[PDB]
Each structure stands twice: as structure tokens, then as C-alpha cells.
Amino acid sequence: GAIIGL
Amino acid sequence: GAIIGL
Amino acid sequence: GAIIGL
Amino acid sequence: GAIIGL
Amino acid sequence: GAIIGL
Amino acid sequence: GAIIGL
Amino acid sequence: GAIIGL
Amino acid sequence: GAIIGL
Amino acid sequence: GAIIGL
Amino acid sequence: GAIIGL
Amino acid sequence: GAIIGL
Amino acid sequence: GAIIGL
């Protein structure tokens, strides 16, 4: 999984 | 943003 | 699954 | 930013 | 895993 | 910055 | 998959 | 931008 | 995967 | 910039 | 992997 | 700059 952004 | 692989 | 947006 | 490999 | 950003 | 290999 | 844009 | 390989 | 942009 | 090989 | 930019 | 071989 990944989280991309601020 | 994006949350991937939930 | 994924969540894309703010 | 990016959090990868969750 | 990795964290990239501030 | 980058935190790698978590 | 891919996301292209701002 | 582009996010590739999700 | 890749992220290209600011 | 570019983040490659995620 | 690589990170290119500031 | 460049960070290579992560």
C-alpha cells in the first residue's frame, strides 16, 4: 500500500 | 492525493 | 482498493 | 510526500 | 517501506 | 528528506 | 494503474 | 505530474 | 512505480 | 523531480 | 530506486 | 540533486 500527497 | 492498496 | 482525491 | 510499502 | 518528503 | 528501508 | 495530472 | 505503476 | 512532478 | 523504483 | 530533484 | 541506489 501507499499514501501519496500531503 | 492517493491512497493505494487498501 | 484505493481512494483518490483530497 | 510519499509513504511507500505500507 | 519508505517515507519521502518533509 | 527520505527514510529508506523501513 | 496510473494517475496523470495535478 | 504522473504517478505510475499503482 | 514512479512519481514524477513536484 | 522524479521518484523512481517505488 | 532513486530520487532526483531538490 | 540525486539519490541513487535506494
Swiss-Prot record, chains A, B, C, D, E, F, G, H, I, J, K, L:
What is the superkingdom listed in this entry's lineage?
Answer: Eukaryota
Site, Implicated in free radical propagation: residue positions:
5
**Designated name of the protein:** P3(40)
Native organism: Homo sapiens (Human)
Whole-protein residues included: 700 to 705 of 770
